[PDB]
């Protein structure tokens, strides 16, 4: 069995590298922004024996700014470097945002009569939709167990992008879209709330001032899903949550009381979000109630008939 596994493992690693190399070669040959003279040179060195991950990264993936394949390379190489990983995530998000904005612009010109730039093939997804498509494609290929998904660093970055680029209600997007994304991808509920707590305590920009209203809304949505999950898992077994989650919702209520007060005394006139915040207060209290009941004994009596 040992000799079998060692060969199955060598073939699995070399197959992972080979697919990366094939994805690169195909993309480079098809890229409009690559001169023909270079493409023939790329085809010579990549359509043959499998190359090392260093070369694939330095000589090709990094030169062409294929940041998604850079991340797959950091995964195949067991690359321990959080800072470079996050730099690559930041470049991939920004590159995709600019590409989505460009395609929506070209569209708006068609729907208005103008002419596109020469050699531009004529309702493309909003930028936050194309961005999260890129995150999904990588996650399914790396399985979320990778070091290219440090949720403690990657979730705040994605939330930062949503704020600093208005990927919120103004354009008709769900303001909780970053949370939906990582939950559906299979991030455990406890880890989400744990990170969101750290976002709220440290107050790193842009998560500052009255925009912590949005952080509280993410916490509300995450805890809500967590509660639903626990209730579902209890019914499941008929046929972890600590007091820290309750404390976190209390502080969240205090943040909302602070934001509303500051909003009422702003220069130029009171803030327009008065009832929007009052609603969030009710939701947060409802969640603290549910969490308090579960913590207080209703969680050990979930498999029992009522």
């Amino acid at each position: 069995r040992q000799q079998q596994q060692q060969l199955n493992h060598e073939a699995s690693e070399l197959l992972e590298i080979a697919h990366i190399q094939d994805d690169l070669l195909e993309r480079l040959v098809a890229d409009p922004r690559i001169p023909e003279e270079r493409k023939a040179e790329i085809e010579e060195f990549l359509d043959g024996p499998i190359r090392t991950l260093t070369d694939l990264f330095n000589d090709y993936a990094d030169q062409a700014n294929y940041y998604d394949l850079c991340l797959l390379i950091f995964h195949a190489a067991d690359f321990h470097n959080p800072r470079t990983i996050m730099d690559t995530w930041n470049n991939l998000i920004n590159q995709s945002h600019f590409e989505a904005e460009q395609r929506r612009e070209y569209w708006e010109i068609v729907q208005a009569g103008g002419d596109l730039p020469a050699g531009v093939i004529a309702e493309p997804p909003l930028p936050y939709v194309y961005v999260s498509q890129q995150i999904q494609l990588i996650a399914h290929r790396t399985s979320l167990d990778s070091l290219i998904f440090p949720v403690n660093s990657l979730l705040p970055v994605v939330c930062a992008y949503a704020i600093n680029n208005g990927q919120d209600a103004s354009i008709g997007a769900d303001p909780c879209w970053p949370i939906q994304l990582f939950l559906n991808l299979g991030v455990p509920h406890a880890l989400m709330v744990q990170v969101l707590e750290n976002v709220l305590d440290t107050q790193e920009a842009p998560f500052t001032g009255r925009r912590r209203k949005l952080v509280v809304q993410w916490i509300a949505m995450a805890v809500d899903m967590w509660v639903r999950e626990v209730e579902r898992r209890g019914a499941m077994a008929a046929a972890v949550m600590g007091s820290w989650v309750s404390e976190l919702l209390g502080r969240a209520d205090q943040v909302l009381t602070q934001i509303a007060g500051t909003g009422a005394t702003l220069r130029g006139g009171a803030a327009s979000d008065a009832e929007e915040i009052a609603s969030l207060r009710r939701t947060v209290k409802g969640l603290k109630r549910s969490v308090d009941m579960l913590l207080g004994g209703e969680m050990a009596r979930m498999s029992f008939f009522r």
Binding site: I34, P35, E37, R38, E41, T52, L53, T54, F57, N58, D59, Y60, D62, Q63, A64, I73, F74, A77, F79, T84
Partner: peptide, 17 residues
């Protein structure tokens, strides 16, 4: 085994020779 070396590469956007 990966080793990044931004120093000396080959200009991916220039022909050879």
């Amino acid at each position: 085994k990966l080793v990044i070396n931004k120093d000396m590469r080959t200009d991916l956007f220039s022909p050879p020779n």
